[PDB]
Design a binder for this molecule. Sequence first.
Ligand SMILES: CCCCCCCCCCCCCCCCCCCC(=O)O[C@H](COC(=O)CCCCCCCCCCCCCC)COP(=O)(O)OCCN
Ligand SMILES: CCCCCCCCCCCCO[C@@H]1O[C@H](CO)[C@@H](O[C@H]2O[C@H](CO)[C@@H](O)[C@H](O)[C@H]2O)[C@H](O)[C@H]1O
Ligand SMILES: CCCCCCCCCCCCO[C@@H]1O[C@H](CO)[C@@H](O[C@H]2O[C@H](CO)[C@@H](O)[C@H](O)[C@H]2O)[C@H](O)[C@H]1O
Ligand SMILES: CCCCCCCCCCCCO[C@@H]1O[C@H](CO)[C@@H](O[C@H]2O[C@H](CO)[C@@H](O)[C@H](O)[C@H]2O)[C@H](O)[C@H]1O
Ligand SMILES: CCCCCCCCCCCCO[C@@H]1O[C@H](CO)[C@@H](O[C@H]2O[C@H](CO)[C@@H](O)[C@H](O)[C@H]2O)[C@H](O)[C@H]1O
Ligand SMILES: CCCCCCCCCCCCO[C@@H]1O[C@H](CO)[C@@H](O[C@H]2O[C@H](CO)[C@@H](O)[C@H](O)[C@H]2O)[C@H](O)[C@H]1O
Ligand SMILES: CCCCCCCCCCCCO[C@@H]1O[C@H](CO)[C@@H](O[C@H]2O[C@H](CO)[C@@H](O)[C@H](O)[C@H]2O)[C@H](O)[C@H]1O
Ligand SMILES: CCCCCCCCCCCCO[C@@H]1O[C@H](CO)[C@@H](O[C@H]2O[C@H](CO)[C@@H](O)[C@H](O)[C@H]2O)[C@H](O)[C@H]1O
Ligand SMILES: CCCCCCCCCCCCO[C@@H]1O[C@H](CO)[C@@H](O[C@H]2O[C@H](CO)[C@@H](O)[C@H](O)[C@H]2O)[C@H](O)[C@H]1O
Ligand SMILES: Cc1cc2nc3c(=O)[nH]c(=O)nc-3n(C[C@H](O)[C@H](O)[C@H](O)COP(=O)(O)O)c2cc1C
Ligand SMILES: Cc1cc2nc3c(=O)[nH]c(=O)nc-3n(C[C@H](O)[C@H](O)[C@H](O)CO)c2cc1C
Ligand code: SF4
Ligand code: SF4
Ligand code: SF4
Ligand code: SF4
Ligand code: FES
Lengths: 349, 189, 213, 195, 476, 71, 112
Amino acid sequence: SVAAGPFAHDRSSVNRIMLDVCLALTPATLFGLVMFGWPAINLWLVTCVSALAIEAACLRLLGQPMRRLLDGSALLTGWLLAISLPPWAPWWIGVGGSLFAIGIGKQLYGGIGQNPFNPAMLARVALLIAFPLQMTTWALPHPLFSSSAPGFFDSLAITFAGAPLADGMTGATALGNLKTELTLNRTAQEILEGGFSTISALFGSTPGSLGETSELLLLVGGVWLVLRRIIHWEIPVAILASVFVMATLAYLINPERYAGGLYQLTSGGLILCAFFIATDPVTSPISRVGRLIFGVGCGVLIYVIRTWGSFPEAAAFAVLFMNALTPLIDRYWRPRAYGRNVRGKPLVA
Amino acid sequence: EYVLFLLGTVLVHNVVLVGFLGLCPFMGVSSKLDPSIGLAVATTLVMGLGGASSWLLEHYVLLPLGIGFIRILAYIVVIAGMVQLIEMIIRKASPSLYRSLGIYLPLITTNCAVLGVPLLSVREGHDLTMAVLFGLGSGLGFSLIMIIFAGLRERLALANVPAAFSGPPIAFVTAGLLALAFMGFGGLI
Amino acid sequence: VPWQYFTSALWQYNVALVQMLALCPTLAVTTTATNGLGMGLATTLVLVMTNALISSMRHTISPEVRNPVMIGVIAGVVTLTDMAMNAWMHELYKVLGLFIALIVTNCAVLGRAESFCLRNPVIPSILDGAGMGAGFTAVLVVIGGIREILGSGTLFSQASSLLGSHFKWMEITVIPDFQGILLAILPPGAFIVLGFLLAAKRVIDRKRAERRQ
Amino acid sequence: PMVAYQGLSLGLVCAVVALLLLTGNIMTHGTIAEQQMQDRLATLREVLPQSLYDNNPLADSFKVQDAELGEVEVLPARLQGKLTAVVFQGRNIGYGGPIEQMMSVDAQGKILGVRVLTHKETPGLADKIEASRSDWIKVFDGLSLENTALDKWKVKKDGGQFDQFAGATITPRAVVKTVLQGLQFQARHAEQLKA
Amino acid sequence: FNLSSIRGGVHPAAHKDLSAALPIGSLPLPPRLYLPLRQHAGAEALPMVAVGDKVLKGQLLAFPPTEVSAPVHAPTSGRIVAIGPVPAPHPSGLTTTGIVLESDGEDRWIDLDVSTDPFAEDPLVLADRVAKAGIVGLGGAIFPAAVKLKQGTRHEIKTVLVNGSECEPYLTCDDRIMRERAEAIVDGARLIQHILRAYSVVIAIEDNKPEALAAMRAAAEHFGAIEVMAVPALYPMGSAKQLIQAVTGREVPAGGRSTDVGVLVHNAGTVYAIQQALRFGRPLISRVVTVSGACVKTPQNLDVLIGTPVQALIDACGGLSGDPQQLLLGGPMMGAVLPSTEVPVIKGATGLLALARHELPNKDPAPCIRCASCVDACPMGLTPLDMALYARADDYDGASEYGLRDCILCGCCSYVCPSHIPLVHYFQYAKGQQDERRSAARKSDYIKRQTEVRAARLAEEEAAKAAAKAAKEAAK
Amino acid sequence: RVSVVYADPAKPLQLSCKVEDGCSVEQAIQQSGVLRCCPDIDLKKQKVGVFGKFVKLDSPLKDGDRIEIYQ
Amino acid sequence: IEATLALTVMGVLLGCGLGLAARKFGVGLAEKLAAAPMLARVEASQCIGCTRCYRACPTDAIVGASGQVHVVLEDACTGCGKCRDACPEDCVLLIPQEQTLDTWRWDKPAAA
Ligand SMILES: CCCCCCCCCCCCCCCCCCCC(=O)O[C@H](COC(=O)CCCCCCCCCCCCCC)COP(=O)(O)OCCN
Ligand SMILES: CCCCCCCCCCCCO[C@@H]1O[C@H](CO)[C@@H](O[C@H]2O[C@H](CO)[C@@H](O)[C@H](O)[C@H]2O)[C@H](O)[C@H]1O
Ligand SMILES: CCCCCCCCCCCCO[C@@H]1O[C@H](CO)[C@@H](O[C@H]2O[C@H](CO)[C@@H](O)[C@H](O)[C@H]2O)[C@H](O)[C@H]1O
Ligand SMILES: CCCCCCCCCCCCO[C@@H]1O[C@H](CO)[C@@H](O[C@H]2O[C@H](CO)[C@@H](O)[C@H](O)[C@H]2O)[C@H](O)[C@H]1O
Ligand SMILES: CCCCCCCCCCCCO[C@@H]1O[C@H](CO)[C@@H](O[C@H]2O[C@H](CO)[C@@H](O)[C@H](O)[C@H]2O)[C@H](O)[C@H]1O
Ligand SMILES: CCCCCCCCCCCCO[C@@H]1O[C@H](CO)[C@@H](O[C@H]2O[C@H](CO)[C@@H](O)[C@H](O)[C@H]2O)[C@H](O)[C@H]1O
Ligand SMILES: CCCCCCCCCCCCO[C@@H]1O[C@H](CO)[C@@H](O[C@H]2O[C@H](CO)[C@@H](O)[C@H](O)[C@H]2O)[C@H](O)[C@H]1O
Ligand SMILES: CCCCCCCCCCCCO[C@@H]1O[C@H](CO)[C@@H](O[C@H]2O[C@H](CO)[C@@H](O)[C@H](O)[C@H]2O)[C@H](O)[C@H]1O
Ligand SMILES: CCCCCCCCCCCCO[C@@H]1O[C@H](CO)[C@@H](O[C@H]2O[C@H](CO)[C@@H](O)[C@H](O)[C@H]2O)[C@H](O)[C@H]1O
Ligand SMILES: Cc1cc2nc3c(=O)[nH]c(=O)nc-3n(C[C@H](O)[C@H](O)[C@H](O)COP(=O)(O)O)c2cc1C
Ligand SMILES: Cc1cc2nc3c(=O)[nH]c(=O)nc-3n(C[C@H](O)[C@H](O)[C@H](O)CO)c2cc1C
Ligand code: SF4
Ligand code: SF4
Ligand code: SF4
Ligand code: SF4
Ligand code: FES
């Protein structure tokens, strides 16, 4: 057997890409771990380790090389799922999420590069549908080493086993609170005047998911990813612009019922989804117009299901729907060739 | 409004993912995209015509005579006859047209959707316009789901799916995941 | 041998597992083992009666309007079954709902009526219908049992109120003190279970062929 | 193979089948109606004890037009020409849509039992309204508008006395509001409903 | 004019500074030369000499059988010893028909047929003069220059483009050929502009060759219409389809030649060969090759006679200073692995790279992650991932729909692939399979036509003979 | 437009050459250049045929003919 | 009864219409509808110019006539064997086609 060319390469690798994504996620992950305390650390470690172990088992069953474990595509899935989960969640929530993602969502279709849906978001949706009580309990920020957060073994009892969180440690967030108070015949202004501060919401000093809370360190990480040419700006720009424009229009039309702009941007996992999750290379279009369509659809779906839907946030549902729509976009928006028109016929000259 | 009704029929109340109607042709023909599009158009037209004919038969013949328990039989029989005509009339008048609608028409003579939708619409007590819109919306939802699933299966056919799951089983798993994804539209309309 | 059709229709040609038919009731009424068993029994009875009628009326059907005749011969029978189990099995009728009426369009029923009942005597058609019904019932029971065990832990629950007190011996409980995974009962849980059953069928067929070799 | 024969076959089939279907219908329609009536009685019996009523409750159905609820379906339970209980239905918007429940209030304002008939709340989070999973719906069993002023008829979130589900408060709000509206509606309409 | 911008492209490490310092060296005459009879594209030339014949430097050993071919001339005087099989510079290593010439060492020229005032004759005479000289387009495409010029004459040419933008890494032959022989290249460009009635010549060099640009500008400063342009330093820039877009701004229509947009592209070595052939009558006998790599003691450029074995070139440049992990005939991006050092040097040989282990990247193939970095780097604007997906599943017809027809095998796909996939290998395999199917279909059509014609002629002859015999017996 | 074939078992050659209409086998063979390929060809000694029939050097040939030189 | 007659009028009309249309104008099977070469070889001794191979060869593969001329094949052969039994001395030696440079194709990559 002879060797074919080319005999040059740019030293690129999948491991570098995945580890760079993890490094970008690192600062917001640390901010979330410090803010919520030890149970967040326990859940994060459990989710990541379970994801890696299940990936190794699935690779062993399928006969694939164990070196596929070293590219970090499973650690990244576990990381994103763990930072997408509530902070003070039980261990079995994380273990089941990792099992449902790495497994059905990824390894049952062949492995990396073969699945049609986002694994982490698939696991998140499955957990929310199957276990709605454990996925809707948001703990207030109890900073590490603050004399009010539970200790090490108390946090062990909180995460493993079933020690109750007592009283006064669980609060309501922003989106769900706004929707509930709107159902309480209060206009959209009084709810936000005395129950929402943009400065504290943008920094990340509010209850929420593990890494979703801070919409600034996530922005820094996404900007670093964009500059390093790992992701394309089309999807984040389109998602954020669509959400902001729709929110501003609805605020201008009916200010007493719709909240728009800064409130929508600095709430939920919109920035995390736009930068780190909606930009999944395997389940996103390979074109430019295709990526723009993907982003605009994601933003429109997110806003529509936020405002009029039955969920406080629909980043996962929007991402899954657009992952379903991806193949048609790929096959109907191919780039133009050389010496041919957009229809594929040879140029005339 | 009617746009809300149509969108709720297409997305919130999809006839396949939450209705489990017309799954055999849906799982059999969605391997390729062109047959999927052809069957989608054919089933949309057939469902609209069947809804209109079923409402006319129920509110002009069955109820005035007092025989309602017969409805099922009458329904399917009429639909069957209609389908045959819509095949044969388009197997001579326009031979070119017997490549996008005529070929797939025998598949939907008995589809469980062309009969499920009229029976569901009877219980809701829809009028003629509402019945026709219900049929058209269910057909549109079936068409959109079939097209999306055909695209997904075409992309999966060129992937490294394990030998124990390649084919129908991976299609069923993907359809379950698709239903899970569509589960986010609940309560919107 | 006439008994060959009954044995061969169980696994060699399974209606919902080999021919890829009758998927609507397979996926819809499967949240409990009792629902699957009742639907399978009703479909088996309808198949037997329709096959017998079609075969006894075999040399009377014109080729061009074969469908609207036989469909009628099916539809009326189905109607009677409806009007039967709406009157004396109302508890089971309220659970199945629309899919007891949607047996006329069941692809397996019409497929067996057309393919086999138009070129075989009455006894082979009856045996083929019984075999297809038994295979469909077995598939439904398996899928319903798996889904019910996953979603609730219990197996064959409320058999007494649905299928009569005589079947009270079938109510068993697996995994006591278990709240269950809610996703199995939901529509996302049906397609996945069916796909896994198909994969298991393929694997066991390959292994059986290897052992025979 | 002649145009006469296809029509004759497709007419004979539809004639024989129609005759059989009509015979089956005339055989089983009475049994079907009896089964439906028995199901209605079984649904009613879960809130109304047998000893309280003597006549048939689903025979003297009233229809009262109020100012808020609209038109109601009050079923009286008279022992000997005297009203002892009234059973009606209340509807109110919850989280996933309207919730329809049945209430049986005695002749003195005490509640004899509340059951929820139709709901589409999220399973596993707000499904305790059903009596088959929890006894929360059995809280309203001795209350009235006399021993409970217009301050305790709210969930504990709004400053009342009725418990709320862990992670689900809108559904308890809707149920409590429906119960309070039913009690106030009985209070407004005297005599016929009050006695 | 003004340079436009091409789409896609990569920036590999040039490695051009270790060999483009010393001037063009010379080779001692090797004992024997192996000249393959097919050093061009199209039909194979037919030998005219026998075993043992004495030939002079420049004798026409083989002549073209058809229009699309080129003759083979004897690089040096000697005696023919074999007309048989010789090793071929191919990855497979299979032999090919070729002559073996034993170098006498006298190196005596033949009586060449020189011209007189080349700027006096009609273009067809110059075209056939180029045809009878063996010019073969020393650019890699090894297409005959006479055919290209003749096709260019029929259309209207508005620009003659000298493709001096040497873009492959490690290769510096064009750089020296333009530093040292700018005057001859300019004269050849003027001769080509006379052959094809045109407006101007637009000689193009990459910006990473300041000395070549300075030499060319100094040489061509008084002739007017001659222009020197400095294209950017991008790898797929020397390709005709991309250089035409960079210079003119137009795109060559798919399935069409460069003359449609009125541009003719010639290499900086082919122009020099044309100038030599027209002015002095010298055929194509020797070219300039580059010996480079970390396993060669002194990388350099050598004026190599055609048919010289590779081992002579390796020995001339000091020698193998270590273990050469790969031997490539050309640049890393489009080169081929040499079987051994006994392989000769054809007219299309561009380099003799000896790449060590620390210069060759290590690759562990992995499943495609759909990063779409192939689409961003493809010069032709194709989707390499889809083509590889369809070629792996033996769906060549579906791969052609995604651009396999227009692929130029540049190698920009595998150079930017995170999961190291041999995309170019898949494309070459698919193109080979398509070519095999096409050849089989062509053979089937030809044999069916031959059978039809032979049967028809035999039947008509038999019928005519039978009729003639029947007429003969009637009068008997 | 005709073809010239050398049936030498060691090396069977086939070439195609365009000749003026009304030409002869001698002139067609001279134009085809088969003599320079094989100097051991004796046009007066070896057999020259058309489609398997021995022919004469100055015999006229038509379009589509196949001159063959063999033992 | 009007019901049986109104459901018989339908049964005769929908049958007569279908019959008229037919005269004038399985689910599984329905979806299926919708969805080493060799060359001859002649040695230098077994051929005596008996012209039998050219006589039995539909293709113009064998070239030559007369006797002691050593007729040889061409590239037009297809291995049909029409010349095998034709030769009394069994000169035809059909063999598989050998690999050459012009018939060399790249091999598929192993796996990923
Ligand atoms: C009380 C206990 C509860 C336990 C519940 C467990 C829940 C698990 C949920 C899914 C998580 C893991 C998903 C499986 C990962 C598959 C990875 C590939 C493995 C695979 O395909 O292996 C093949 C074996 O398949 C087979 O042979 C498939 C057998 C299927 C068994 C039947 C399962 C029915 C139940 C389905 C449950 C679905 C739950 C959904 C909510 C053979 O590999 P190959 O042939 O390619 O060879 C390759 C080398 N030679
Ligand atoms: C590195 C190994 C793998 C790591 C992953 C698995 C870790 C599992 C940790 C074991 C489970 C946690 O174990 C947890 O222990 C703590 C601290 O004693 C107990 O804590 C509780 O019970 C103890 C009884 O001794 C009380 O004194 C204490 O005040 C109370 O918090 C919890 O009831 C138990 O749930
Ligand atoms: C991929 C990593 C997966 C991490 C999985 C870690 C799971 C660990 C579960 C910890 C056990 C929780 O379940 C617990 O079991 C036992 C009862 O048998 C009791 O727990 C007690 O015993 C267990 C071991 O038996 C001790 O580890 C624990 O410290 C102690 O509190 C608690 O009543 C119950 O809460
Ligand atoms: C559908 C998508 C997700 C796939 C999920 C796959 C299954 C994951 C586990 C589902 C279990 C649900 O059932 C769940 O069982 C766990 C045990 O694990 C019980 O957990 C109980 O024991 C565990 C230790 O084992 C304690 O830590 C816990 O505090 C206690 O409640 C939960 O009270 C019950 O809710
Ligand atoms: C490497 C990246 C950087 C790593 C940073 C790690 C340190 C992070 C510490 C900040 C997190 C905790 O810090 C903060 O604590 C306070 C109480 O002390 C919490 O509680 C309160 O703080 C804010 C202050 O604006 C109040 O307005 C608000 O009512 C409430 O949220 C915050 O929600 C939490 O944000
Ligand atoms: C994100 C990238 C795309 C940017 C695109 C920008 C295009 C639109 C520009 C017009 C935007 C006007 O944006 C306007 O800003 C005001 C503050 O001035 C914000 O309004 C803000 O303060 C008001 C009260 O003062 C609050 O009630 C409101 O909830 C809060 O968002 C709104 O978001 C919007 O009403
Ligand atoms: C799927 C079922 C089998 C196919 C059904 C085809 C139609 C058959 C109709 C005849 C049914 C005979 O069934 C007969 O009905 C009686 C009621 O009279 C049932 O008797 C019992 O059934 C119900 C179930 O809803 C019990 O709750 C109740 O205590 C009792 O009435 C028995 O099950 C059987 O004795
Ligand atoms: C890589 C991932 C590794 C995952 C590791 C999974 C093993 C973890 C073992 C946890 C310990 C046992 O976990 C569980 O404990 C609870 C009490 O807490 C008991 O569980 C009990 O409730 C569960 C509810 O789902 C039911 O199975 C049953 O009613 C009973 O067993 C059992 O003891 C054991 O099922
Ligand atoms: C692909 C693009 C799709 C674009 C979709 C945009 C159209 C959807 C928004 C317009 C409809 C708003 O719909 C409005 O909102 C509520 C919930 O918020 C819907 O839903 C409401 O009613 C339904 C039925 O009773 C129940 O689910 C429940 O009571 C409540 O959710 C109502 O039907 C309507 O009052
Ligand atoms: C990827 C690629 C790179 C090429 N690089 C060069 C180059 O550097 N120099 C060159 O003269 N031709 C290059 N060519 C192709 C031809 O040699 C050139 O475009 C033109 O055809 C020269 O014609 P000639 O051989 O008649 O001179 C390249 C072709 C490809 C596909
Ligand atoms: C930019 C980027 C974003 C990613 N986002 C996700 C994600 O949201 N969920 C996930 O499971 N993997 C994610 N991955 C990992 C990888 O895309 C995933 O393993 C593929 O789905 C493999 O099937 C991401 C990787 C990159 C480089
Ligand atoms: S560069 Fe490689 S991994 Fe990226 S899309 Fe192309 S083939 Fe896939
Ligand atoms: S090899 Fe072909 S597909 Fe790849 S970059 Fe070059 S032209 Fe594009
Ligand atoms: S048949 Fe045999 S002997 Fe006769 S001519 Fe042909 S090869 Fe020669
Ligand atoms: S095998 Fe057939 S084609 Fe080939 S030489 Fe013999 S007869 Fe001719
Ligand atoms: S489509 Fe086949 S049973 Fe419904």
